[PDB]
RNA sequence: AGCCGGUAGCGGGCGUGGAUCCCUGGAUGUCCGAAUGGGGGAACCCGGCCGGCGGGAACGCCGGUCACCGCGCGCGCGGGGGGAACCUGGGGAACUGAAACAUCUCAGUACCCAGAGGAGAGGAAAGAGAAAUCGACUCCCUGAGUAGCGGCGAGCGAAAGGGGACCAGCCUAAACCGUCCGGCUUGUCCGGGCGGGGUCGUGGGGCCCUCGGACCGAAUCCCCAGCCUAGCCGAAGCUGUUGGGAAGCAGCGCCAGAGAGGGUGAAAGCCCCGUAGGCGAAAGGUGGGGGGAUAGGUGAGGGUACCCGAGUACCCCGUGGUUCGUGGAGCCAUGGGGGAAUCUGGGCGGACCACCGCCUAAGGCUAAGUACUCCGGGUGACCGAUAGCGCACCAGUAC
RNA sequence: GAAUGCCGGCAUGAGUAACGAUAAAGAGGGUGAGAAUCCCUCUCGCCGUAAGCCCAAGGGUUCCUACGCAAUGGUCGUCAGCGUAGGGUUAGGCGGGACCUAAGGUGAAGCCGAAAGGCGUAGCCGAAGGGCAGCCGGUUAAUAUUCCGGCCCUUCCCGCAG
RNA sequence: AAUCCGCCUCCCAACAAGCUCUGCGUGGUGGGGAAGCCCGGGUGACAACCCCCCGAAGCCAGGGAGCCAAGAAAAGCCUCUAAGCACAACCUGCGGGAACCCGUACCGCAAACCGACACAGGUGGGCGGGUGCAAGAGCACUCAGGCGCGCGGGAGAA
């Protein structure tokens, strides 16, 4: 019915695996069809660009490459640790994500 | 619901259609099922004019392909209405 | 050849069995079948025309059920039948079956 | 069209009478033709307008039908 | 919390005031198609009547309506067409086997047709068949390759009984009573409709005397639980190291009603999706389970001899069904001829007869247990792109 | 490892036969990376009851223009009935329909047949037959009895008059 | 039903006329208009646009004769009357308005149709000029128009 995403634009994530294991950053974008996220300044790649109006002088640009969403973990804004998410039902009762290490909301 | 604006789809944009403006002949793409009598009325209520003559012809969609895939463009009808002496359809004079 | 409007008797299929030889019961060696082929047995259909309510009604009926038409006429006396068409009369009559 | 403007269209439409709905559709169908013409000579950069209008007309006709349905 | 299908781009927009998306219900739904105003070379053409639009009478468009057949009093209701297998009924081969071939086999199969439906058929004994017996029907095991049938060849092949599955029985016709309507041959008339009555094999009912005077309960209806059509919660890992990448190796931990399985840059219980265990429907569908209602159901002697399904039984002729191929050939069915009776009647127990028993024909209905798999899901000592469906891919396509 | 097996790939024959009518060519100029093969000119030859022109079938965008040459073209290709794109088909009078009927088809009535279905005076359908009002010229890259121009005409509705 | 059509009789007309329909000619008017010469277009040009001959298988047409094998239907159209209706209706003349849907490009004896091919095959109807050969749609040459057939260049054996 919908792809499940534990992370979203733009909470703060630890990149927990791959060349950039350890980095922290904001999620610029979430791509559910690919099950991927863009994290700011993580997975940079060099891309060739043709001499074009969009890019006179041509040469190359840097692009951020998507990461498999499973490589990424939200950092709790209360306790500051990378966490799994739990859901908690409020009194509304809307439901929310909460850090699983302490109890804080993650938004 | 059916209105004059469902009968006239778009004006015809071509050197041939423009050449008709001079003598009061306006050429529209119309709905393929529309009758001369009905187009007469539709044009008159949409452009506040008096239609004196209506010519219609069917235009077959061209066959076209993108790679592997053979297809066809939609079939169309075009209509050429003549307005009363002196009248003009300004939306078309345009150009 | 067809269907009895009264009994529903209809053509049926039968075998025609051809035999040669002397029956055992008569001291013979026995019967041998020299042929079996399908055939039909039809009802003995005939036409029966009757005046009922000043109209001429006709029935296609097996001979066995010829009296059943007249009995229907009797039972018809109790009916408002005058002025109907012969198709309509026949329906009322048949409905009595 | 913005979601809030859609609600707003439905509320305003639902207050109208069949006849007023007919006039309004006819005007919107007219406004669509103007748009079509502009798209065809390349002067309609704001092309989302066409999808929009077409759905307003739907929504209105949908409501007209509500009104007449009983 | 993203989104404007595959699908990027141009060019523009939408969404926590909750979008996209999923489920339910509704609206719109050109033309063709049963196709149904009429015509027709399907997807086009041409009309009638009512209403509307345009300047509108001609012309055109928009809305509504108009086929035929059946049943019931012009109007109502219904029918028509489709569906992969399954099912019943009406018809119905041949190769082949018989080491030739005709009876026989293949086979009442293939196939054509009609019809049904989520099943269909069958079903409440005129049964079985030897038991002093059983007790509707269906379906499985067995009985049994028995009994038998058979150019006694090739081959064909039951049933009772026993073990199971499921379980349920009902409504009429007739006697007689009442009512409406019709008939001419005027009533103690005949006939048609409707209602009452009645439903059985220890025979039962009717009618006339006598005596006696609340329980059961649907297969119909209503409510509800449960179920389906979207979903949701869901335990526990960090560090170092090699490496493009750790989930590998190393160190120290933790969860477990969860160590099924799939992902993640390689090999991960603890990263993701899940899993165990739980939760969930405003709407539509189901509801064989629970509850309620309603229809419907229920006595005993005694007398009477009124009724108890007709071109029927029964006999003969021609055939089919059965294991039964003419046989000692009954039984069930019926195309032809003949042709009864109402229980002191009738059919049956393998020619026939007697005796002794069994059973009540010629009206109808009836869940479940059974079959199938277009559809959804689960699972494989199933395939892995010459395989597996004809098709993993835009295939019933190109050709 | 064999089934003139099946599917696929690739060899051999072989730089071989052939390149599809023996109506036939030559030159100059242009264009282009490239030219016997495309464009233009002159010369030559062939058809001319056709190998020219107009209709109907059938075909279905093949038409005109611009940009192209991988493949298609029996060679080549700058060209093309090829690729991409854009344009192009205009009717009261032509043809068919809103007219007629032919064979035949279908088919109220009606007849027949296990089912499916087969017939069937009327009617209906059915044409390249009957019936019915447009000729000449001009215009586009590409349509013209269709657009335009000139001169003519048909039916239907309404009205007026006789 | 009928005043129509058929049949009988009489009067007048009869290889005529009259009435009617068509072909052709003319006809207000509107168009076209060569070679050659310049770059499809300009000019030629104020173009001329006349006389004679030949002459259809086409037209008048539903013409004529002869023959035997004896040669569609139905509507349009005219006429007759019936229900009706006779303020209607129909006919004639004039005027104003109204006049729908489909086809139409292009190939079309062929490289675009039928033959798996840009295939020496097959494909119905009309037009099909001139001269000469008795005639002709034959034959030769040739007009308009269209082509040299989508491999070529050499060589000069069997
Ligand atoms: Mg969720
Ligand atoms: Mg680190
Ligand atoms: Mg919520
Ligand atoms: Mg609509
Ligand atoms: Mg032009
Ligand atoms: Mg209109
Ligand atoms: Mg047209
Ligand atoms: Mg398309
Ligand atoms: Mg016989
Ligand atoms: Mg014997
Ligand atoms: Mg003996
Ligand atoms: Mg024998
Ligand atoms: Mg008789
Ligand atoms: Mg008999
Ligand atoms: Mg008899
Ligand atoms: Mg898209
Ligand atoms: Mg953009
Ligand atoms: Mg964008
Ligand atoms: Mg909500
Ligand atoms: Mg829906
Ligand atoms: Mg439409
Ligand atoms: Mg339809
Ligand atoms: Mg129809
Ligand atoms: Mg029809
Ligand atoms: Mg209609
Ligand atoms: Mg009207
Ligand atoms: Mg007007
Ligand atoms: Mg009107
Ligand atoms: Mg209509
Ligand atoms: Mg049926
Ligand atoms: Mg059905
Ligand atoms: Mg059968
Ligand atoms: Mg039958
Ligand atoms: Mg049979
Ligand atoms: Mg046969
Ligand atoms: Mg045989
Ligand atoms: Mg065999
Ligand atoms: Mg054998
Ligand atoms: Mg044999
Ligand atoms: Mg043999
Ligand atoms: Mg033999
Ligand atoms: Mg045999
Ligand atoms: Mg066999
Ligand atoms: Mg058999
Ligand atoms: Mg059968
Ligand atoms: Mg089968
Ligand atoms: Mg059916
Ligand atoms: Mg079931
Ligand atoms: Mg059942
Ligand atoms: Mg049943
Ligand atoms: Mg019973
Ligand atoms: Mg045994
Ligand atoms: Mg057998
Ligand atoms: Mg037996
Ligand atoms: Mg048993
Ligand atoms: Mg048992
Ligand atoms: Mg069971
Ligand atoms: Mg009676
Ligand atoms: Mg009585
Ligand atoms: Mg009575
Ligand atoms: Mg008794
Ligand atoms: Mg019941
Ligand atoms: Mg979860
Ligand atoms: Mg987890
Ligand atoms: Mg490293
Ligand atoms: Mg690690
Ligand atoms: Mg370890
Ligand atoms: Mg487990
Ligand atoms: Mg595992
Ligand atoms: Mg795993
Ligand atoms: Mg491991
Ligand atoms: Mg492993
Ligand atoms: Mg794992
Ligand atoms: Mg569970
Ligand atoms: Mg669960
Ligand atoms: Mg008693
Ligand atoms: Mg009695
Ligand atoms: Mg009985
Ligand atoms: Mg009876
Ligand atoms: Mg017998
Ligand atoms: Mg037998
Ligand atoms: Mg014997
Ligand atoms: Mg027997
Ligand atoms: Mg009999
Ligand atoms: Mg007895
Ligand atoms: Mg007796
Ligand atoms: Mg018996
Ligand atoms: Mg007997
Ligand atoms: Mg006996
Ligand atoms: Mg017995
Ligand atoms: Mg018995
Ligand atoms: Mg039954
Ligand atoms: Mg039950
Ligand atoms: Mg069952
Ligand atoms: Mg099953
Ligand atoms: Mg499945
Ligand atoms: Mg595998
Ligand atoms: Mg493969
Ligand atoms: Mg395969
Ligand atoms: Mg492979
Ligand atoms: Mg498949
Ligand atoms: Mg395959
Ligand atoms: Mg395949
Ligand atoms: Mg394909
Ligand atoms: Mg070998
Ligand atoms: Mg070989
Ligand atoms: Mg070979
Ligand atoms: Mg082979
Ligand atoms: Mg091999
Ligand atoms: Mg092979
Ligand atoms: Mg091979
Ligand atoms: Mg080779
Ligand atoms: Mg060589
Ligand atoms: Mg050689
Ligand atoms: Mg050689
Ligand atoms: Mg050779
Ligand atoms: Mg060759
Ligand atoms: Mg050679
Ligand atoms: Mg050649
Ligand atoms: Mg050659
Ligand atoms: Mg030669
Ligand atoms: Mg040259
Ligand atoms: Mg040169
Ligand atoms: Mg060249
Ligand atoms: Mg070249
Ligand atoms: Mg050449
Ligand atoms: Mg050239
Ligand atoms: Mg020659
Ligand atoms: Mg000549
Ligand atoms: Mg073709
Ligand atoms: Mg093409
Ligand atoms: Mg053209
Ligand atoms: Mg083209
Ligand atoms: Mg071209
Ligand atoms: Mg070019
Ligand atoms: Mg090429
Ligand atoms: Mg090339
Ligand atoms: Mg090349
Ligand atoms: Mg290309
Ligand atoms: Mg090629
Ligand atoms: Mg080439
Ligand atoms: Mg070739
Ligand atoms: Mg070039
Ligand atoms: Mg070409
Ligand atoms: Mg092209
Ligand atoms: Mg015209
Ligand atoms: Mg009309
Ligand atoms: Mg017609
Ligand atoms: Mg007709
Ligand atoms: Mg027929
Ligand atoms: Mg006929
Ligand atoms: Mg007609
Ligand atoms: Mg015609
Ligand atoms: Mg004609
Ligand atoms: Mg016409
Ligand atoms: Mg015409
Ligand atoms: Mg004319
Ligand atoms: Mg042309
Ligand atoms: Mg053109
Ligand atoms: Mg004109
Ligand atoms: Mg007057
Ligand atoms: Mg008379
Ligand atoms: Mg003249
Ligand atoms: Mg004249
Ligand atoms: Mg000139
Ligand atoms: Mg010149
Ligand atoms: Mg001049
Ligand atoms: Mg001068
Ligand atoms: Mg003559
Ligand atoms: Mg006739
Ligand atoms: Mg007629
Ligand atoms: Mg009168
Ligand atoms: Mg008059
Ligand atoms: Mg006039
Ligand atoms: Mg019409
Ligand atoms: Mg058209
Ligand atoms: Mg055509
Ligand atoms: Mg044209
Ligand atoms: Mg043309
Ligand atoms: Mg050509
Ligand atoms: Mg041509
Ligand atoms: Mg030829
Ligand atoms: Mg020809
Ligand atoms: Mg040609
Ligand atoms: Mg060809
Ligand atoms: Mg070809
Ligand atoms: Mg060629
Ligand atoms: Mg050829
Ligand atoms: Mg020929
Ligand atoms: Mg001569
Ligand atoms: Mg000569
Ligand atoms: Mg000569
Ligand atoms: Mg000549
Ligand atoms: Mg010649
Ligand atoms: Mg020349
Ligand atoms: Mg040549
Ligand atoms: Mg040599
Ligand atoms: Zn925290």
Swiss-Prot record, chain A:
This is Large ribosomal subunit protein uL24. One of two assembly initiator proteins, it binds directly to the 5'-end of the 23S rRNA, where it nucleates assembly of the 50S subunit. It comes from the Bacteria. Part of the 50S ribosomal subunit. One of its GO terms (molecular function) is rRNA binding. GO terms for biological process: translation. The gene is rplX. It comes from Thermus thermophilus (strain ATCC 27634 / DSM 579 / HB8). SUPFAM superfamilies: Translation proteins SH3-like domain. Keywords: Ribonucleoprotein, Ribosomal protein, RNA-binding, rRNA-binding. One of its GO terms (cellular component) is ribosome. Belongs to the universal ribosomal protein uL24 family.
Swiss-Prot record, chain B:
One of its GO terms (molecular function) is structural constituent of ribosome. GO terms for cellular component: ribonucleoprotein complex; ribosome. Transmembrane segments: none annotated. InterPro entries: Nucleotide-bd_a/b_plait_sf, Ribosomal_uL23-like, Ribosomal_uL23/eL15/eS24_sf. PANTHER family: 60S RIBOSOMAL PROTEIN L23A (PTHR11620). Contacts protein L29, and trigger factor when it is bound to the ribosome. Part of the 50S ribosomal subunit. One of the early assembly proteins it binds 23S rRNA. One of the proteins that surrounds the polypeptide exit tunnel on the outside of the ribosome. Forms the main docking site for trigger factor binding to the ribosome. Belongs to the universal ribosomal protein uL23 family. This is Large ribosomal subunit protein uL23. The lineage of its organism: Bacteria, Thermotogati, Deinococcota, Deinococci, Thermales.
Curated annotation (Swiss-Prot), chain C:
InterPro entries: Bacterial_rp_bL28, Ribosomal_bL28, Ribosomal_bL28/bL31-like_sf, Ribosomal_bL28_bact-type. It comes from the Bacteria. One of its GO terms (cellular component) is ribonucleoprotein complex. Keywords: Ribonucleoprotein, Ribosomal protein. Pfam families: Ribosomal_L28. GO terms for molecular function: structural constituent of ribosome. GO terms for biological process: translation. The keyword Ribosomal protein applies. NCBIfam families: L28. Belongs to the bacterial ribosomal protein bL28 family. Part of the 50S ribosomal subunit. This is Large ribosomal subunit protein bL28. It comes from Thermus thermophilus (strain ATCC 27634 / DSM 579 / HB8).
From Swiss-Prot, chain D:
Keywords: Ribonucleoprotein, Ribosomal protein. GO terms for molecular function: structural constituent of ribosome. CDD domains: Ribosomal_L29_HIP (cd00427). This is Large ribosomal subunit protein uL29. The keyword Ribosomal protein applies. Belongs to the universal ribosomal protein uL29 family. GO terms for cellular component: cytosolic large ribosomal subunit. The gene is rpmC. SUPFAM superfamilies: Ribosomal protein L29 (L29p). Part of the 50S ribosomal subunit.
């Amino acid at each position: 019915m919908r792809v499940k995403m534990h992370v979203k634009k733009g909470d703060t994530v630890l990149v927990a695996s791959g060349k950039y294991k350890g980095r922290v950053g904001k999620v610029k974008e979430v791509l559910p069809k690919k099950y991927a996220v863009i994290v700011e300044g993580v997975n940079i790649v060099k891309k060739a660009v043709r001499v074009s109006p969009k890019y006179p002088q041509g040469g190359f640009i840097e692009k951020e490459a998507p990461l498999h969403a499973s490589k990424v973990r939200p950092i709790c804004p209360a306790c500051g640790k990378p966490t799994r998410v739990r859901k908690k039902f409020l009194e509304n009762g809307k439901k929310i994500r909460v850090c699983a290490k302490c109890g804080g909301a993650l938004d | 619901m059916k209105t004059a604006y469902d009968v006239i789809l778009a004006p015809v944009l071509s050197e041939k259609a423009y050449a008709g403006f001079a003598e009061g002949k306006y050429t529209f793409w119309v709905h393929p099922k529309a009758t001369k009598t009905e187009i007469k009325n539709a044009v008159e209520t949409a452009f506040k004019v008096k239609v004196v003559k209506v010519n219609t012809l069917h235009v077959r969609g061209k066959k076209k392909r993108l790679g592997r895939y053979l297809g066809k463009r939609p079939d169309r009808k075009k209509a050429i209405v003549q307005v009363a002496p002196g009248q003009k359809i300004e939306a078309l004079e345009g150009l | 050849s067809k269907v009895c409007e009264i009994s529903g008797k209809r053509p049926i299929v039968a075998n025609s069995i051809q035999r040669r030889g002397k029956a055992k019961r008569e001291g013979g060696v026995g019967k041998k079948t020299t042929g079996i082929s399908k055939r039909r047995q039809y009802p003995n259909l005939q036409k029966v025309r009757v005046r009922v309510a000043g109209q001429e009604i006709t029935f296609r009926v097996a001979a066995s059920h010829i009296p059943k038409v007249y009995e229907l006429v009797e039972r018809a006396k109790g009916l408002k039948l005058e002025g109907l068409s012969p198709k309509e009369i026949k329906k009322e009559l048949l409905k009595l079956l | 069209m913005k979601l809030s403007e859609v609600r707003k269209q439905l509320e305003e439409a639902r207050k109208l009478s069949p006849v007023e709905l007919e006039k309004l559709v006819r005007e919107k169908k007219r406004e669509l033709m103007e748009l079509r013409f502009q798209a065809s000579i390349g002067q309609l950069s704001q092309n989302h307008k066409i999808r929009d209008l077409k759905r307003q007309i739907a929504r209105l006709l949908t409501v007209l039908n509500e009104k007449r349905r009983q």
